[PDB]
Design an enzyme around this catalytic site. Structure first.
Site, PDB file in Angstrom:
ATOM      1  N   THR A  45       6.954  78.824 158.434  1.00  0.00           N
ATOM      2  CA  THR A  45       7.074  80.266 158.561  1.00  0.00           C
ATOM      3  C   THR A  45       8.337  80.794 157.900  1.00  0.00           C
ATOM      4  O   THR A  45       9.233  80.032 157.526  1.00  0.00           O
ATOM      5  CB  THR A  45       7.153  80.716 160.039  1.00  0.00           C
ATOM      6  OG1 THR A  45       8.336  80.204 160.637  1.00  0.00           O
ATOM      7  CG2 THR A  45       5.966  80.229 160.871  1.00  0.00           C
ATOM      8  N   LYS A  94       3.703  83.594 158.426  1.00  0.00           N
ATOM      9  CA  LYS A  94       3.335  82.203 158.151  1.00  0.00           C
ATOM     10  C   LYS A  94       3.219  81.776 156.687  1.00  0.00           C
ATOM     11  O   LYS A  94       2.692  82.504 155.839  1.00  0.00           O
ATOM     12  CB  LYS A  94       2.033  81.846 158.880  1.00  0.00           C
ATOM     13  CG  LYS A  94       2.217  81.406 160.325  1.00  0.00           C
ATOM     14  CD  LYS A  94       2.943  82.467 161.165  1.00  0.00           C
ATOM     15  CE  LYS A  94       3.061  82.015 162.612  1.00  0.00           C
ATOM     16  NZ  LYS A  94       3.529  83.090 163.516  1.00  0.00           N
TER      17      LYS A  94
HETATM   18  O1  LIG Z   1       9.425  80.808 163.091  1.00  0.00           O
HETATM   19  C1  LIG Z   1       9.395  79.859 163.847  1.00  0.00           C
HETATM   20  C2  LIG Z   1       8.456  78.652 163.605  1.00  0.00           C
HETATM   21  C3  LIG Z   1       8.090  77.910 164.888  1.00  0.00           C
HETATM   22  C4  LIG Z   1       7.197  76.702 164.617  1.00  0.00           C
HETATM   23  C5  LIG Z   1       7.265  75.914 163.450  1.00  0.00           C
HETATM   24  C6  LIG Z   1       6.318  74.706 163.292  1.00  0.00           C
HETATM   25  C7  LIG Z   1       5.403  74.383 164.277  1.00  0.00           C
HETATM   26  O2  LIG Z   1       4.586  73.334 164.142  1.00  0.00           O
HETATM   27  C8  LIG Z   1       5.334  75.246 165.545  1.00  0.00           C
HETATM   28  C9  LIG Z   1       6.165  76.325 165.706  1.00  0.00           C
HETATM   29  O3  LIG Z   1       9.213  77.492 165.651  1.00  0.00           O
HETATM   30  C10 LIG Z   1      10.125  78.451 166.011  1.00  0.00           C
HETATM   31  C11 LIG Z   1      10.887  78.331 167.151  1.00  0.00           C
HETATM   32  C12 LIG Z   1      11.901  79.415 167.560  1.00  0.00           C
HETATM   33  O4  LIG Z   1      12.633  79.273 168.669  1.00  0.00           O
HETATM   34  C13 LIG Z   1      12.034  80.542 166.780  1.00  0.00           C
HETATM   35  C14 LIG Z   1      11.211  80.751 165.490  1.00  0.00           C
HETATM   36  C15 LIG Z   1      10.295  79.759 165.146  1.00  0.00           C
END
Ligand SMILES: O=C1C[C@@H](c2ccc(O)cc2)Oc2cc(O)ccc21
Length: 212
Positions: A45, A94
Site C-alpha cells: 500500500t 493499495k
Molecule cells: O498501510 C498499511 C499496510 C498494512 C498491511 C500491509 C500488508 C499486509 O499483508 C496487511 C496489512 O499494514 C499497516 C499497519 C499500520 O499500523 C498502519 C498502515 C498499514
C-alpha cells in the site's frame, strides 16, 4: 508552495476537500507500507497523511522557525500532529490487492499493541476495535482502491472506502472512542513506528508553511 506526491504511481494531491465535513486539508506527507520477506521489502500500500488547513496556526506557536532536521528528531513535534486540535485525514491506497480482513488484521494488530502499551485498552477500546474490524469485513481493495481514515479531534474515527482514489461521499462507519481515534495515525508517525518515510515528509514540508 505545497506540492503533491506520487507513490508507486498512486498520486496524492497537494490539497483536498472532504464531502463529509466540508473542510480542506494539505498533504503533510506520503509513503509506502508492506512486508519484509526474506530480507526483501514487498510493497502493498501507499499512505498519505493530510492535515486540516488550520493545523498550521495550531503548530506555529511551538514549531515555527525549527529546521526540518530539528523537527525530525523531536518526538513532541509528532505528538502535536497526532493529537493536535485539528482533523487529520489518512488515505491508504493499495499497490497489491488485499481484502478488507487481510489489510485490517495488521492495522488492528499495531493499534492494539499501542493501546495496551500506553495503558488505554479496556472493554470500550476492545469493542471499538471489534467495530473497526466489522467495517472492513465486507470490503476488498484491488490495486488503486483506497481506505480513508478521518481522525476528528472530537474523539471519533471515521472510515471510508473507495474503489479508486476519490474521497467517498459518505462514510461507512464511525468509531467513537478517544484512544482508538488516534491509534491508527500513531502507528504511522508515532514514536514506535519504524518506517520513517512519513515522519521525514512532515519534517521537510511543514517548516515552509509554519513561517508564512
Ligand atoms: O498501510 C498499511 C499496510 C498494512 C498491511 C500491509 C500488508 C499486509 O499483508 C496487511 C496489512 O499494514 C499497516 C499497519 C499500520 O499500523 C498502519 C498502515 C498499514
Amino acid at each position: 508552495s505545497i506540492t503533491a506526491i506520487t507513490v508507486e504511481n498512486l498520486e496524492y494531491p497537494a490539497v483536498v476537500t472532504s464531502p463529509v465535513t466540508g473542510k480542506s486539508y494539505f498533504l503533510g506527507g506520503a509513503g509506502e507500507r508492506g512486508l519484509t520477506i526474506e530480507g526483501n521489502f514487498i510493497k502493498f500500500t501507499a499512505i498519505g497523511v493530510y492535515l486540516e488547513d488550520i493545523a498550521v496556526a495550531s503548530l506555529a506557536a511551538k514549531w515555527k522557525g525549527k529546521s526540518s532536521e530539528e523537527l525530525l528528531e523531536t518526538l513532541d513535534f509528532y505528538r502535536d500532529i497526532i493529537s493536535g486540535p485539528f482533523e487529520k485525514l489518512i488515505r491508504g491506497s493499495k499497490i497489491r490487492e488485499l481484502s478488507g480482513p487481510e489489510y485490517s488484521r495488521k492495522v488492528m494488530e499495531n493499534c492494539v499493541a499501542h493501546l495496551k502499551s500506553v495503558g488505554t485498552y479496556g472493554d470500550a477500546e476492545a469493542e471499538a476495535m471489534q467495530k473497526f474490524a466489522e467495517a472492513f469485513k465486507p470490503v476488498n481493495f484491488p490495486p488503486g482502491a483506497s481506505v480513508f481514515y478521518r481522525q476528528s479531534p472530537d474523539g471519533i474515527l471515521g472510515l471510508s472506502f473507495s474503489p479508486d482514489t476519490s474521497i467517498p461521499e459518505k462514510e461507512a462507519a464511525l468509531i467513537e472512542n478517544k484512544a482508538v481515534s488516534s491509534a491508527v495515525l500513531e502507528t504511522m508517525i508515532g514514536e514506535h513506528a519504524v518506517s520513517p518515510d512519513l515522519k521525514r515528509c512532515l519534517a521537510a514540508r511543514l517548516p515552509a508553511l509554519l513561517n508564512e
